[PDB]
Amino acid sequence: MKLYIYDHCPYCLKARMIFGLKNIPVELHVLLNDDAETPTRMVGQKQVPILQKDDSRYMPESMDIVHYVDKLDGKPLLTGKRSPAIEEWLRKVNGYANKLLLPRFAKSAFDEFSTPAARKYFVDKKEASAGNFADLLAHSDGLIKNISDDLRALDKLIVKPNAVNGELSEDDIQLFPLLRNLTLVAGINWPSRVADYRDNMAKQTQINLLSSMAI
Fold it and tell me: How many whole angstroms separate alpha carbon 96 and alpha carbon 171?
């Protein structure tokens, strides 16, 4: 099995997560962010993650891949309960997280950005207006207080450091990619349980954190 991804994309992280949790090997292939042609040839549009099955066919869409992989060994892991407090917490922070992450993605050493034209494609898609990313970067200190404050509320909701509700659930798939990527944001005050969950779930999922390149 081969998984075509961008390293930064949270939807690709969800698919990566389920392989790591089930200790199922997968060959990661990172696509240049301006590569429309390869994904279009595989599944029609320019979208990732793409999973090449062992029958060599291609499947898109991240939650479809998570469910398909969870069944491969007949022992689905995502059986835990969901939590309304976690979905409201995600609903709020997703409204502004990208103001911290996108301008930092654009600047960071991700394989999908490793040619000038690939990095610039991302910026051309995602930057509202010329130099807006620098204005967002200039306002990082208000944003870093907000995420720090919201992480303190999340600190109260983490039941176990290895599963946010106490048993591995789809909330883990929705929450960890966000916390993975937020470790690219230098300055965050990480509360203790969030930090334990962040580090534990990264060890379980076999996904790296970004602390060494945080900005």
Answer: 19
